[PDB]
Each structure stands twice: as C-alpha cells, then as structure tokens.
C-alpha cells in the first residue's frame, strides 16, 4: 500500500520572510552572485568535513572525495549543485544561516582550537538566499553521518517545508536543486556557468566539475 511520508511545515522568521519577499519582488542586476554564494556554502561545507577528519578520520566512510559538481538540466529547467561536504543535520537545516544570527557560531569556538580557519558561513542570513535571484523554488537534500537524509524546500511565501528524504541517498554531502525562473534560462548554458565560476569562484581550494548534457 501507500506510505505516509512524514512532513513538517515551518515559517520563515519575520525579517527573513520580508527579505525573501524583497528578493523576489525586486529586480536586481548582478543576479550572477547566486552561484558564488552557493559555491561558498559547498566549499565551507567541505571545510567542515576537512576539519572533522583530522580529529575523526572515520567520518570518511560515507565519502572521502571533496569536490563540487554542477549538474544543469536544460529539459527540467533545474540547476543542481552537489557537494560531498559535511552535509547538514536536522539542526543545521532548521538553524540555518538566517535563523541563527548575532548569536555566535558555537562550533566555531572549538573548531578554531582544532586548527580550523574562518570558512563556515553558518549565521549570515544572506548568502544562501541568493538562490531566489534566479530560482523560483529551491530544494536542498542533505545527509550528515550523524543524522538522516532530509529534504528542505520552499517557494517563499513566508513558509518552508522539511521532510525525511525517501529519495536517492547521496551517501554524504549536499544537493541543492534550483528551479530557475522562465526568464533565467541563460544559466542553463555550460558557457554561462563557466563565465560565472571562473570569475567568482576562481579561488576555490576544491575541484569543480560541470556535467554538460
């Protein structure tokens, strides 16, 4: 018979929701920043796992490769960004960069002592939301070794849903699926992608691969 997947609906915090409204209902010229910020999330996520392995190498069972993969789908009108980073936990998903702000990143304190550098955008509620400059809806599927695989999703409107993901398991890392707006079909070209990544993501200490259909 059918299975009833568990679902949970939350609302964006007041100022975040208004920011979401601002982004979508206002025209911006330099929309291309979306890729730079999203790549930063992936690299920072890779830095998280990078530092995990020095103190606990067994976290690499779910994957040792550290890279960013771009998968454009010209037929679906979707741009998929996948990384093999630390992945996100149910806590990190809901307490994302935006909900927790001006509170101070707790992990950063102990991470600093472990020898970690400042490369963890987990508080600044601005970078991640750049996805809505090009996409109408973004879904983020992630799994962290210490947690299950979850799917976060929202079409703005002040609300967002989270659910346990029964789909394809990535092992470890982050999968962000951007549903680009109809007027944003330019970012489905392999050339346009390279244009942005070379320019904005040139100083990435990890391999970047674009899968061109």
UniProtKB/TrEMBL annotation:
It is found in: Cytoplasm. Residues 30-184 form the Histidine kinase/HSP90-like ATPase domain. Coiled coil: none annotated. Belongs to the heat shock protein 90 family. The gene is HSP90AA1. This is HSP90AA1 protein. ATP binds at residues 37, 41, 83, 88, 96, 102-104, 123-128, 174.
